């Protein structure tokens, strides 16, 4: 029982460490301590906990530098095969969209710095400092943290333009029917601005179709949604996006679900919170579409908008991770992660709330076809479902 308020973190670059490498073994241990006596997710996933300590412990006694050892830590928490059992790193960047669709990795929209390297859009990305890209990706998954192999992939597709250690990436692109080779330096984070984007976006399709995107739950989520949430409050049909939404804030996703249900509904994170609809609460058809990349505070939204029955799910099965209580903890040489410590839970309906994605009504998968020609799959069907 965690009756202290949460610790802050301090978040390093490996190569930066501030522990020497005589305090390695020490520091390992008491991680290992921490997550025994803390992570409440490892006995319910039957995780061989007694091999994983030993073989890292083995690799930390035999680590000469801070990235060596930091590599080895992240490699051992992503072992924990949790979303939000996760390290406090900081990653080298481009700061890069990508596309990975059937299987495929795309850049997506190149910004301005990849602009600078000569990547275009569309560009597919074949190989990885000559490695090709799907082997890159499952010699990659053991530094990803994730509670399922397909969300483990994504995060590690997304992770093309970002390393713990690398500060240059080799690439070799498919370009019109043309193969070619960019290397392209990974920066620090802050040399890119942060995102000063709308949170919540609203639009009308067809003069009777409504679109939102809510992007993130974290703050300011309510005031952008409410500011444009009455654009389409009154129209007949809604379609609603959290395919980008990667949490945030549980109790935002339980603010925005008020204005979607019919009745009383308790909120599946904390079933003590009984939902009650607002008073300007949306009266028609419902549309959300969900995606792998969809996790936490957006899965709790979007288990609770499944579970209303006033909502209809289209597109891919959730990342699968409610969350499960994560909290911040410290080494005494300065080593922080963060695990959770609540125990495994399931929904009103026996939904597990973390080892597998919430599924939807209609399975729906963005293709290569349609991407080239900008073209979103899952939107598309929404609509058509609409105009049937």
């Known amino acids: 029982f965690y009756n202290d308020k949460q610790i802050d973190v301090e978040n390093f670059y490996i190569a930066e460490l501030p522990l020497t490498p005589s305090q390695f073994e020490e520091d390992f241990k008491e991680i290992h301590q921490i997550v025994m006596e803390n992570y409440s997710l490892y006995q319910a996933k039957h995780l061989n906990m007694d091999s994983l300590y030993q073989a890292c412990d083995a690799r930390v006694r035999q680590a000469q530098t801070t990235t060596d050892y930091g590599l080895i830590v992240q490699e051992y928490i992503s072992a924990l095969q949790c979303a939000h059992a996760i390290t406090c790193y900081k990653r080298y960047t481009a700061n890069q969209r990508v596309a990975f669709i059937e299987d495929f990795l795309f850049v997506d929209k190149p910004n301005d710095y990849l602009t600078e390297y000569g990547f275009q859009d ?66 620090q984070r802050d040399y890119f601005p942060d995102n000063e984007e709308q949170t919540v976006e609203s639009r009308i399709l067809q003069d009777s179709i409504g679109y939102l995107t809510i992007k993130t739950m974290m703050n300011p989520v309510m005031e952008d949604f409410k500011a444009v949430y009455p654009k389409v409050k009154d129209l007949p049909y809604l379609i609603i996006d959290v395919r980008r939404n990667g949490g945030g804030n549980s109790m935002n996703g339980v603010n925005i679900c008020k204005y979607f249900i019919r009745e009383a ?64 903890f410290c080494t005494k040489q300065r080593t922080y992660f963060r695990i959770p410590t609540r125990q495994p839970d399931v929904s009103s309906k026996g939904f597990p709330m973390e080892g597998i994605g919430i599924p ?12 080239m020609k900008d073209e979103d799959t899952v939107l598309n069907y929404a609509v058509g479902l609409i105009t049937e």
């Not at 939902?275 to 899965?299: F, H, N, R, V």
């Open 122 to 187: 569309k560009d597919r990305i074949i190989a990885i400092n000559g490695l090709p890209y799907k082997q890159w990706i499952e010699q990659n998954e053991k530094y990803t943290e994730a509670s399922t192999v397909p969300h483990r992939r994504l995060r590690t597709a997304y992770d093309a333009f970002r390393s713990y250690a690398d500060t240059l990436r080799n690439y070799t692109l498919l370009r019109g029917g043309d193969t070619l080779t960019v290397t392209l330096p990974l920066k």
């Open 360 to 371: 939807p009504h209609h399975q729906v998968s963005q293709t290569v076809a349609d991407f």
């Open 265 to 328: 509904q308790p909120h599946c994170v904390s079933k003590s919170y009984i939902m009650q609809p607002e008073a300007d609460a949306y009266k028609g058809k419902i549309y959300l579409l969900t995606d792998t990349y969809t996790l936490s505070a957006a899965e709790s939204f979007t288990l609770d908008m499944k579970e209303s029955g006033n909502v209809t799910l289209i597109g891919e099965a959730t990342g699968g991770d409610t969350g499960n209580g994560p909290r911040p």
